[PDB]
Amino acid sequence: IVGGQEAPRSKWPWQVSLRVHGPYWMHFCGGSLIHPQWVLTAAHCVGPDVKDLAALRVQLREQHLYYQDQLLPVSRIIVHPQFYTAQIGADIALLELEEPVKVSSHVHTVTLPPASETFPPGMPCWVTGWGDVDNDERLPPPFPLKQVKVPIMENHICDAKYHLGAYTGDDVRIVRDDMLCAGNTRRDSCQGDSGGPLVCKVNGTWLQAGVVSWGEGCAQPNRPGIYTRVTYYLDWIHHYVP
Amino acid sequence: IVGGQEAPRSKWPWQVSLRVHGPYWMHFCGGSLIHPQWVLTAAHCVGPDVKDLAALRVQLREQHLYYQDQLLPVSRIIVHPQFYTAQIGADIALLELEEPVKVSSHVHTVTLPPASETFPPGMPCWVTGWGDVDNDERLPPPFPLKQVKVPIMENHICDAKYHLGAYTGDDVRIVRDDMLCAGNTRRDSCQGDSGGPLVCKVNGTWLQAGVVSWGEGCAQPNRPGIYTRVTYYLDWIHHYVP
Amino acid sequence: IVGGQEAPRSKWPWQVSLRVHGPYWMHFCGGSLIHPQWVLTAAHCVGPDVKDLAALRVQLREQHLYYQDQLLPVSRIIVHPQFYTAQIGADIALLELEEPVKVSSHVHTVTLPPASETFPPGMPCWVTGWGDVDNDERLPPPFPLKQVKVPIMENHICDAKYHLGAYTGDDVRIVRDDMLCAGNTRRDSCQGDSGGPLVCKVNGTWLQAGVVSWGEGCAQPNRPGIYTRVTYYLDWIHHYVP
Amino acid sequence: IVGGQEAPRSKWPWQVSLRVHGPYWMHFCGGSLIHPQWVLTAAHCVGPDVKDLAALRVQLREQHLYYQDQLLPVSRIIVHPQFYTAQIGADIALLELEEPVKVSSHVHTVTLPPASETFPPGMPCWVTGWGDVDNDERLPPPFPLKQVKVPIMENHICDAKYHLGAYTGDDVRIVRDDMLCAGNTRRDSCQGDSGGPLVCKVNGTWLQAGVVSWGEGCAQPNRPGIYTRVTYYLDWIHHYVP
Numbered sequence: 028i029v030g031g032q033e034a035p036r037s038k039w040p041w042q043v044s045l046r047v048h049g050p051y052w053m054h055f056c057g058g059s060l061i062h063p064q065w066v067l068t069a070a071h072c073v074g075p076d077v078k079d080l081a082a083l084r085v086q087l088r089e090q091h092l093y094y095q096d097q098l099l100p101v102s103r104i105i106v107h108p109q110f111y112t113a114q115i116g117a118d119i120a121l122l123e124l125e126e127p128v129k130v131s132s133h134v135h136t137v138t139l140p141p142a143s144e145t146f147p148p149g150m151p152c153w154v155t156g157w158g159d160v161d162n163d164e165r166l167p168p169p170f171p172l173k174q175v176k177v178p179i180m181e182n183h184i185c186d187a188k189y190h191l192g193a194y195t196g197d198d199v200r201i202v203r204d205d206m207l208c209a210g211n212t213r214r215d216s217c218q219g220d221s222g223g224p225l226v227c228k229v230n231g232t233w234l235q236a237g238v239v240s241w242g243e244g245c246a247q248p249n250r251p252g253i254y255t256r257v258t259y260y261l262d263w264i265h266h267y268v269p
Numbered sequence: 270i271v272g273g274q275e276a277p278r279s280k281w282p283w284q285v286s287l288r289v290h291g292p293y294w295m296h297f298c299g300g301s302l303i304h305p306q307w308v309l310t311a312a313h314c315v316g317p318d319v320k321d322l323a324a325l326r327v328q329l330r331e332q333h334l335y336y337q338d339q340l341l342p343v344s345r346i347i348v349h350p351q352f353y354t355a356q357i358g359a360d361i362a363l364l365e366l367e368e369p370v371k372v373s374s375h376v377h378t379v380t381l382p383p384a385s386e387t388f389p390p391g392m393p394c395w396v397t398g399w400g401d402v403d404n405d406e407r408l409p410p411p412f413p414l415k416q417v418k419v420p421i422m423e424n425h426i427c428d429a430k431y432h433l434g435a436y437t438g439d440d441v442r443i444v445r446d447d448m449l450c451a452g453n454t455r456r457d458s459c460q461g462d463s464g465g466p467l468v469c470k471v472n473g474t475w476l477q478a479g480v481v482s483w484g485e486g487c488a489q490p491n492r493p494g495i496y497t498r499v500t501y502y503l504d505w506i507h508h509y510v511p
Numbered sequence: 512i513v514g515g516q517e518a519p520r521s522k523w524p525w526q527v528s529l530r531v532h533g534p535y536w537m538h539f540c541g542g543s544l545i546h547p548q549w550v551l552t553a554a555h556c557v558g559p560d561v562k563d564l565a566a567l568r569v570q571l572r573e574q575h576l577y578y579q580d581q582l583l584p585v586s587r588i589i590v591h592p593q594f595y596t597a598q599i600g601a602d603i604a605l606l607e608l609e610e611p612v613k614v615s616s617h618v619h620t621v622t623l624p625p626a627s628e629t630f631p632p633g634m635p636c637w638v639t640g641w642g643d644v645d646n647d648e649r650l651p652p653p654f655p656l657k658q659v660k661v662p663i664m665e666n667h668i669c670d671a672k673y674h675l676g677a678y679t680g681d682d683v684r685i686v687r688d689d690m691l692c693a694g695n696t697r698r699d700s701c702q703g704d705s706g707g708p709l710v711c712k713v714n715g716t717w718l719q720a721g722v723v724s725w726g727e728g729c730a731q732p733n734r735p736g737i738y739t740r741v742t743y744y745l746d747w748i749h750h751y752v753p
Numbered sequence: 754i755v756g757g758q759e760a761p762r763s764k765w766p767w768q769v770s771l772r773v774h775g776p777y778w779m780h781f782c783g784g785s786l787i788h789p790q791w792v793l794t795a796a797h798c799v800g801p802d803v804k805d806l807a808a809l810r811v812q813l814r815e816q817h818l819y820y821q822d823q824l825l826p827v828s829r830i831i832v833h834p835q836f837y838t839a840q841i842g843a844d845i846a847l848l849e850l851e852e853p854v855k856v857s858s859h860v861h862t863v864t865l866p867p868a869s870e871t872f873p874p875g876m877p878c879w880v881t882g883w884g885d886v887d888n889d890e891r892l893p894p895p896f897p898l899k900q901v902k903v904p905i906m907e908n909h910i911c912d913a914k915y916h917l918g919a920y921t922g923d924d925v926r927i928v929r930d931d932m933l934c935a936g937n938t939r940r941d942s943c944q945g946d947s948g949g950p951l952v953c954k955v956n957g958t959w960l961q962a963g964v965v966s967w968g969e970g971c972a973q974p975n976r977p978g979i980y981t982r983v984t985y986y987l988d989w990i991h992h993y994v995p
């Protein structure tokens with residue numbers, strides 16, 4: 028997370044960390060609990076290449092990475108069949124936990140938005156995660172969960188911004204309709220935040236508008252952060268999550 | 270270049286080296302001389318972000334990189350407007366030399382293929398370059414130009430192979446019509462070969478079938494090297510090159 | 512620490528962590544509390560180049576590095592004036608805390624040996640710290656404090672060990688009089704443990720026999736770890752420490 | 754070499770490059786031909802750990818490393834028995850080539866100094882090699898041999914410099930009598946130059962005053978380069994070299 032601050036311990040009860048087996052169970056991507064037995068994340072964290080379930084674990088909401096891990100096994104990984112790269116799109120995936128979660132006050136699911144919610148500029152949104160605090164700059168121990176308020180922008184503007192300082196024809200789409208843009212040169216998501224959630228407080232309810240996906244660097248001019256647009260994939264999510 | 274051997278001094282008089290300004294004029298990509306004043310390379314080598322012509326130079330065929338540099342300024346960098354990533358396609362670009370080359374003894378142009386050439390499996394094809402000799406293994410000094418003979422694989426077969434061991438739907442095209450596949454687990458191009466030529470001897474003449482574009486690693490099982498198919502962009506090339 | 516295991520919470524109340532300013536107050540060396548206002552460490556941790564005191568902090572015993580830091584400022588650095596390198600000798604230094612420490616129960620001082628003490632061969636002593644777990648292998652987060660039991664090796668025997676497979680003349684002393692050997696190919700201190708204590712239980716009491724100083728690698732054949740011999744420097748220590 | 758320039762092709766005919774077996778025969782240290790069959794280098798290049806002769810080769814003067822290699826096998830490695838670290842001293846060694854050289858015009862031994870030659874300040878002196886061009890900044894391809902004129906500094910004056918900004922006692926000698934100092938913040942040797950020749954022109958003749966040994970960084974304030982003083986080791990050299 029670029030800019031922003033360490034999260035209070037009562038906020039973002041839906042945030043998860045994905046761990047890969049190695050010299051230790053290392054954080055590699057974020058995710059969000061959207062159902063007591065299901066985690067929403069980005070496909071580029073787990074695909075397009077199929078990997079071994081046994082080597083993956085999920086850690087639930089934790090103020091400091093690694094401090095008091097309670098790692099959870101995954102029974103299923105479900106990656107959107109349309110996914111190949113983040114720029115092409117469909118950067119979304121689901122993890123079915125071996126067992127449902129004992130939902131607490133410290134840990135619970137985030138609400139998915141109605142298909143109608145567009146998240147227009149002006150909505151108050153936050154992105155959270157344990158990723159780099161800037162380009163090539165790791166989150167320092169003891170790895171607190173971070174949050175940053177980010178401005179949302181309409182897709183046509185974000186797409187046009189990406190063509191500034193680039194060879195790509197203005198008529199050639201860069202930011203697709205299944206994506207959503209947010210951030211500026213001081214507030215952004217970054218490497219390690221991938222898969223994590225962008226949430227917006229709508230009518231008193233925090234809704235997950237997006238999934239940290241990609242961008243050119245972090246907090247770079249005319250290169251806002253790009254998220255997978257959750258509303259686009261409600262149909263797909265509902266094939267699997269009750 | 271993975272596999273193969275150091276090139277004879279007489280072979281591949283069209284191979285060029287692209288250099289970027291820094292501590293030294295460092296090789297970052299290959300290219301081919303297709304006109305005394307024009308160099309053909311890959312788009313991802315010089316984009317999609319717009320670069321300054323001053324930090325760029327071109328070096329014509331050398332047996333050993335850096336050892337007899339006569340660097341050449343470039344007056345125009347022309348990048349295919351459809352390009353954004355190598356997976357999406359249109360990974361091709363043109364460099365106009367500030368001044369025409371005088372066709373030397375070890376410096377000639379490569380012939381572009383007629384639109385009729387599909388380059389079926391079984392044809393004799395070489396890729397050349399000064400890139401990595403394997404995944405994350407640099408070409409050792411004194412940096413001899415390498416060549417390797419690579420088996421051509423039909424697009425549809427190559428596309429289906431890229432799906433092997435991936436989540437990506439059989440529905441979804443990975444290797445596109447503007448691309449071409451060649452290489453196996455012992456013969457391939459790699460990082461630093463990008464922008465370089467793939468050449469096939471057809472009826473007594475060497476034609477440039479492809480431009481080194483991308484792939485999943487180098488020389489990996491079921492992941493042959495991917496090239497920009499030159500016949501697909503003849504029109505665009507001819508729009509600029511006499 | 513090479514080999515051994517995580518230290519129980521009750522043990523080694525004198526162990527401290529030396530921190531350098533930067534992106535975060537990063538641990539670079541160990542040490543020991545020998546008095547409520549004084550920490551014993553290695554000269555090479557804080558020399559021979561004179562350091563900025565404002566860039567230094569001390570952290571009393573912690574089960575896990577970084578989680579719950581309570582960093583203490585330092586008012587004086589005192590480096591033995593004979594120190595230039597660890598191979599030459601005199602690898603010992605003192606840090607004066609700006610304020611006396613409130614001695615606790617899980618933070619006590621360690622007892623220094625009487626002027627005569629020898630610590631005979633074979634005798635089992637303990638070295639502790641947050642250092643690397645092997646050659647080029649960092650202690651994984653959450654960075655638990657490690658301990659390991661290491662056998663003392665008599666100096667002359669150790670010195671000969673250091674001559675095996677070396678050009679250095681037998682009559683040239685490599686392990687010196689102000690040094691002490693301990694460890695084997697399975698149990699040793701390592702980078703990051705430097706400045707930390709080697710302790711022995713003598714007649715029911717833990718005495719600090721040495722300070723982690725140096726060695727040829729960690730736990731390599733014929734190269735036990737070298738510690739600075741505390742008894743050699745008792746007089747110097749007592750000139751500053753009440 | 755820090756500062757200075759590429760050497761003319763006719764100069765320093767005695768310069769040699771030491772190579773170790775790897776992906777390629779990589780340069781790791783310098784040295785000088787002091788006899789058709791003998792190379793003088795630093796001990797820290799080859800010791801104090803005993804090394805396999807079949808893993809080492811010598812390259813006689815080349816304008817550019819690796820470019821036109823003719824590697825020469827070594828029959829004996831002779832490391833001064835007193836060597837253990839460069840700061841301690843006796844950083845000198847001798848390599849016996851498997852066979853004598855065919856002393857041409859491009860290759861020619863350098864002359865050793867008479868015992869009484871002291872090399873006082875003001876004397877004209879150059880150091881040459883293929884080492885780093887600055888701290889942590891490698892010599893760029895195509896790796897030309899560099900040269901630089903270095904100011905000689907009296908041991909006692911040099912010693913004083915080394916005490917500035919250091920905790921080391923004034924009475925503790927850092928720069929020993931078997932060492933010689935030269936260079937400043939613009940001109941100095943550096944990593945990879947070690948073992949190579951420091952030559953001074955005395956009464957029209959070039960004499961090798963020093964062997965590149967060590968220093969605190971390269972070209973740092975108050976830290977001249979330190980060399981083994983050749984005069985000091987004449988007797989030991991002559992016990993082996995006719």
Ligand SMILES: NCc1ccc2c(c1)C1(CCN(C(=O)/C=C/c3ccccc3)CC1)CO2
Nearest residue numbers: 215216217218241242243244245252253353
């Ligand atoms: N702040 C949004 C964001 C969040 C998480 C995250 C990133 C960006 C990455 C930053 C670094 N990366 C790039 O720079 C990609 C360059 C690129 C060049 C050309 C065409 C497309 C893309 C890959 C994405 C790594 O993880």
Ligand SMILES: NCc1ccc2c(c1)C1(CCN(C(=O)/C=C/c3ccccc3)CC1)CO2
Nearest residue numbers: 457458459460463483484485486487494495
């Ligand atoms: N042998 C063909 C080839 C030639 C030159 C060259 C390469 C491959 C690169 C190898 C390393 N790279 C990857 O591994 C890309 C992985 C990838 C994963 C998922 C979807 C798309 C792509 C990027 C391409 C670097 O330059």
Ligand SMILES: NCc1ccc2c(c1)C1(CCN(C(=O)/C=C/c3ccccc3)CC1)CO2
Nearest residue numbers: 699700701702705725726727728729736737
């Ligand atoms: N277990 C003992 C020990 C404890 C802590 C610690 C070390 C060793 C270091 C290990 C790596 N280093 C070396 O290998 C030194 C090689 C050397 C070569 C030639 C002459 C003398 C020495 C430097 C010391 C780093 O910190």
Ligand SMILES: NCc1ccc2c(c1)C1(CCN(C(=O)/C=C/c3ccccc3)CC1)CO2
Nearest residue numbers: 941942943944947967968969970971978979
């Ligand atoms: N220009 C002189 C010179 C020539 C060749 C060469 C060097 C210096 C090295 C530079 C880096 N090094 C150090 O910084 C040593 C630090 C040190 C700290 C404390 C006490 C003694 C020493 C090791 C020597 C590498 O090879």
